[PDB]
Amino acid sequence: VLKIVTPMIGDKVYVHYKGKLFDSPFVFSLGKGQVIKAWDIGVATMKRGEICHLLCKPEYAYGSAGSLPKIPSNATLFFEIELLDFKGEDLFEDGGIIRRTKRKGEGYSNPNEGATVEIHLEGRCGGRMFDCRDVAFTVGEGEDHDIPIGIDKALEKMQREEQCILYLGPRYGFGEAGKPKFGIEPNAELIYEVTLKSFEKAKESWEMDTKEKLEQAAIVKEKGTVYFKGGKYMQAVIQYGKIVSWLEMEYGLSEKESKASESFLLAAFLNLAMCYLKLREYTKAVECCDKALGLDSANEKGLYRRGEAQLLMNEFESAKGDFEKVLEVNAARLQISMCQKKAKEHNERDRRIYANM
């Protein structure tokens, strides 16, 4: 590959080109075999908005097979390439975590939630470095080691020996609380450089026998609750969710395990509903309450919770009932009057807008 007048592995690249010995915004990913070697090698050396020329040998193009009709068998291709722009890969199609690969890794697998990993971590805020260490920890629980949830999430998409830069938006960094020990203000954007050195996966649900699932459920219900008290709801949701995950579908259990299994679920479902309430994620609440109810149709906490949430979603009717059913069993009433009050207000508002629109 000879060149004549910077994107990173995995970046989204935008270019304009002409290729003569046959082809004339073309967007692909750099570093992946999506284009010929010459390009992956070439483009990797352009600064944005630049234009170059490349004499590519078959060895770096379509080799001896060529691409008939167009590209002959031993073709040495020439290229005029224009790098219009390029951006990092958005791990969760939401701009929350932008990754840019420094060094490909190796491996058939990736860390899962619950996996223990050993990484090198370098993190800064506004240019300032506040973290540079080797760390061993549990995916999903990095909070225990002063690591923001974004790193745990990114790790699930990395390989052994991979090194990348991760840009974490507010929703994946330390959040509203900020991180005092690091001099990190509320909802700050963070930048980390991470190298996954090794990792051992946690067992998938189907790989644990009933006995193990029940021992671990007790351990994580507790760990969830500790997090819950500390106001780390996100971490709690993760801990309680294992319980829903490890038991919700079990069967063929003995009466002794079946009761213990049920007991665990019902609680994991009521705790999540409370967790999601704190997280102002109402639909999740109602879902977790729904499950709770499907187990214990006359559950007090269940119905109340389904209520608080449905009210918060302007689902006044549905909410009215939940509290009523709460009364038909054992703050409900004050809330009951609340629904009606808020429902009235809601329709005045609905009528006002429609009229104004």
Side-chain angles (χ1 to χ4, degrees), residues 180-209:
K181 69 143 59 74
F182 293 152
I184 296 175
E185 290 141 272
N187 290 279
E189 300 205 287
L190 304 176
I191 306 204
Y192 285 79
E193 270 195 38
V194 166
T195 292
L196 182 54
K197 295 160 70 177
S198 64
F199 66 84
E200 299 180 301
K201 310 193 76 167
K203 296 177 176 160
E204 299 299 346
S205 51
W206 77 79
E207 299 180 296
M208 310 170 77
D209 61 41

Side-chain angles (χ1 to χ4, degrees), residues 220-221 224-225 236-244 268 271-272 275:
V220 303
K221 169 180 186 302
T225 295
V237 177
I238 290 167
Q239 293 306 301
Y240 293 148
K242 294 158 191 299
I243 305 179
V244 170
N271 285 312
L272 297 170
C275 280

